Design an enzyme around this catalytic site. Structure first.
Site, PDB file in Angstrom:
ATOM      1  N   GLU B  60      20.716   1.651  43.526  1.00 36.32           N
ATOM      2  CA  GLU B  60      21.924   0.717  43.754  1.00 36.32           C
ATOM      3  C   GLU B  60      23.103   1.082  42.970  1.00 36.32           C
ATOM      4  O   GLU B  60      24.232   0.900  43.511  1.00 36.32           O
ATOM      5  CB  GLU B  60      21.425  -0.771  43.363  1.00 36.32           C
ATOM      6  CG  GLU B  60      22.770  -1.502  43.283  1.00 36.32           C
ATOM      7  CD  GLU B  60      22.207  -3.204  43.168  1.00 36.32           C
ATOM      8  OE1 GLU B  60      21.262  -3.451  43.566  1.00 36.32           O
ATOM      9  OE2 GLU B  60      23.135  -3.739  42.395  1.00 36.32           O
ATOM     10  N   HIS B  61      22.944   1.732  41.962  1.00 37.19           N
ATOM     11  CA  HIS B  61      24.144   2.064  41.174  1.00 37.19           C
ATOM     12  C   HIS B  61      24.674   3.184  41.865  1.00 37.19           C
ATOM     13  O   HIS B  61      26.027   3.254  42.293  1.00 37.19           O
ATOM     14  CB  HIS B  61      23.937   2.305  39.894  1.00 37.19           C
ATOM     15  CG  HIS B  61      23.666   1.227  38.845  1.00 37.19           C
ATOM     16  ND1 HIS B  61      24.514   1.274  37.692  1.00 37.19           N
ATOM     17  CD2 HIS B  61      22.988   0.172  38.946  1.00 37.19           C
ATOM     18  CE1 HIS B  61      24.373   0.010  37.102  1.00 37.19           C
ATOM     19  NE2 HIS B  61      23.424  -0.637  38.038  1.00 37.19           N
ATOM     20  N   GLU B 137      24.439  -2.610  30.923  1.00 33.08           N
ATOM     21  CA  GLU B 137      24.021  -4.056  31.436  1.00 33.08           C
ATOM     22  C   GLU B 137      23.194  -4.584  31.138  1.00 33.08           C
ATOM     23  O   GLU B 137      22.854  -5.771  31.102  1.00 33.08           O
ATOM     24  CB  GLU B 137      23.731  -3.716  33.179  1.00 33.08           C
ATOM     25  CG  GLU B 137      25.161  -3.335  33.877  1.00 33.08           C
ATOM     26  CD  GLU B 137      25.082  -2.681  35.423  1.00 33.08           C
ATOM     27  OE1 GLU B 137      26.208  -3.017  36.034  1.00 33.08           O
ATOM     28  OE2 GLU B 137      24.458  -1.742  35.370  1.00 33.08           O
TER      29      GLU B 137
END
Lengths: 53, 446, 60
Positions: B60-61, B137
């Site tokens: 997803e990154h 994160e």
């Protein structure tokens, strides 16, 4: 003035607890009977005739 | 006066199609000038192993940082320049990439998704740049007590299973995950029959089908021999995880029993029950007068700062309960009341409260599916889970079927005399012992 | 084919009503069966009772 508890919801509440209240009486009856050896009541259960005649 | 009932029939049918790929293509046309499109894949941490956990999150990154045909920041500029919005998300069972865009931009929007979903570059320098972003994160996430507490809840409830793991993974996987681990996870999972191309707005089904055939044909032109894409069931465990930290100003607590899973019809009644209990937050107008007894008692006695019920669903399992936030000397009272309400519903639910819970679900259902994005997400993931769409009206009939009895039985089944999973974080000295919590799951008068 | 303890749980233990009813009905029989079975154990090992001794005097 006990009319505070008179309405549809209270009647549904009363219903949901009937089986419970019924079964609690079952427990209380059998329990009183068995603790005093209720001659009257017991003489009718098949086994538990430990009073011969 | 169109009646509510009537209006439910007015909602246009969701159109479904399949390419020879196995890729399902679904839409709900609405005549808006704007739309949402994207792809839903069932891949997520639950499919990962100890070794590659956090893989999807890593993709997803990378997902928006360059394809083969549009390397580096070319994606961004195509999207940004049309005014569209490009988002993505990953849960434990689902992953998504979608575009919000002007309806007449559907063609490129779709062209873009294919490119993302298929030709993701994964340039070695990028993955390295992302290593540190994710780690960051993680530090970031460690400060959200709520996120941490549900992660704990999953970790103890599903203790030796894949569902125990979080989505981001442990820091060491982020550190060691290599490109090959990613490409293998991708090949393993981003395969046609587990993807759904969904759209909602001013589009037409044929255009979307055409585009699906134009830009998506050629994914399962292969299809695997003995691969092994099956999901094993996840053991739920009655357990407790307590992370004591008296340095934190409020306690977070999340209790749950084992839910049935996405497919089970029991979910409708469970949600109705959950609506009755509701949620609460210290910024709600009117507290003492709130319908929910939990909510109103919590507001009058300041037992809480917030609380919410929940029904997380996964395949064949789930988490059904409530999470709350409170002061150190109120955890015991909050639990007592929360648990009194489950018990009460199990054995004693009345009719008018079920009606309120039912209506609350109707409003929630409809309030939610408002706008292209939420409807798209619903088409996309419904096909993943139910296999079909399930039109408003069917939900309406399910909800209508629920009455007091159904609540009592359905609640009893999942709640009554059941071993809960407890997660706690913070000033939790007053959190009740597990035996004590466990004894709150049944009533001695019943 | 569920199991025994499961059946027992479903039909009788789940509710404290039945749970309690079952044990009171359980005590009524256990007492009767324990007293009997236990007396016979006491007797079998003894046998110089007032019982056997009696037999000898239906007369007066």
């Amino acid at each position: 003035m006990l009319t505070r508890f008179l309405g549809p919801r209270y009647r549904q509440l009363a219903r949901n607890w009937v089986p419970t209240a019924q079964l609690w009486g079952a427990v209380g009856a059998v329990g009183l009977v068995w603790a005093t050896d209720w001659r009257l009541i017991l003489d009718w259960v098949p086994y538990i005739n430990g009073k011969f005649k | 006066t169109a009646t509510y009932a009537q209006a439910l029939q007015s909602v246009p049918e969701t159109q479904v199609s399949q390419l020879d790929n196995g890729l399902r293509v679904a839409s709900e046309q609405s005549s808006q000038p704007t739309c949402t499109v994207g792809v839903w894949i069932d891949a997520g941490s639950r499919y990962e192993s100890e070794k590659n956990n956090g893989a999807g999150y890593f993709v997803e990154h990378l997902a928006f940082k360059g394809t083969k045909n549009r390397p580096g920041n070319a994606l961004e500029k195509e999207v940004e320049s049309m005014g569209a919005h490009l988002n993505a998300y990953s849960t434990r069972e689902h992953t998504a990439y979608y575009i919000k865009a002007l309806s007449k931009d559907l063609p490129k929007a779709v062209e873009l998704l294919a490119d993302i979903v298929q030709n993701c570059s994964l340039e070695d320098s990028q993955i390295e740049k992302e290593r540190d972003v994710i780690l960051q994160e993680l530090q970031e996430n460690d400060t959200s007590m709520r996120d941490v507490v549900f992660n704990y809840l999953h970790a103890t409830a599903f203790q030796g299973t894949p569902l125990a793991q979080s989505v981001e993974g442990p820091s060491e996987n982020v550190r060691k995950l290599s490109r090959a681990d990613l490409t293998e996870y991708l090949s393993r999972h981003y395969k046609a029959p587990r993807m759904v191309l969904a759209a909602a707005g001013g589009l037409e089904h044929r255009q979307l089908l055409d585009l699906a055939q134009k830009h998506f044909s050629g994914l399962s032109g292969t299809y695997d021999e003995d691969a092994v894409p099956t999901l094993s069931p996840c053991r739920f465990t009655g357990s407790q995880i307590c992370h004591r930290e008296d340095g934190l100003p409020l306690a977070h607590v999340a209790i749950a029993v084992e839910g049935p899973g996405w497919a089970h019809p029991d979910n409708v009644a469970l949600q109705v029950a959950n609506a009755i209990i509701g949620h609460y937050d210290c910024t709600y107008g009117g507290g003492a007068h709130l319908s929910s007894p939990l909510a109103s008692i919590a507001a009058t006695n300041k037992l809480c700062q917030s609380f919410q019920t929940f029904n997380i669903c996964y395949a064949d399992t789930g988490l059904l309960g409530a999470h709350f936030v409170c002061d150190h000397m109120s955890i015991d009272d909050m639990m007592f009341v929360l648990q009194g309400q489950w018990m009460r519903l199990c054995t004693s639910a009345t009719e008018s409260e079920v009606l309120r819970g039912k209506n609350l679900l109707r409003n929630a259902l409809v309030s939610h599916l408002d706008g292209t994005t939420p409807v798209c997400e619903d088409i996309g993931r419904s096909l993943l889970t139910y296999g079909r769409r399930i039109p408003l009206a069917e939900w309406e009939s399910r909800i209508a079927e629920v009455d007091a009895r159904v609540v009592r039985e359905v609640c009893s089944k999942y709640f009554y005399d059941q071993c809960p999973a407890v997660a706690g974080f913070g000033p939790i000295e007053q959190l009740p012992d597990y035996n004590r919590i466990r004894s709150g799951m049944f009533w001695l008068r019943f | 084919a569920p199991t025994l303890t499961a059946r027992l749980y479903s039909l009788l233990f789940r509710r404290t009503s039945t749970f309690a009813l079952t044990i009171v009905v359980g005590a009524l029989f256990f007492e009767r069966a324990f007293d009997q079975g236990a007396d016979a154990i006491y007797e079998h090992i003894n046998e110089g009772k007032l019982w056997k001794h009696i037999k000898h005097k239906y007369e007066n």
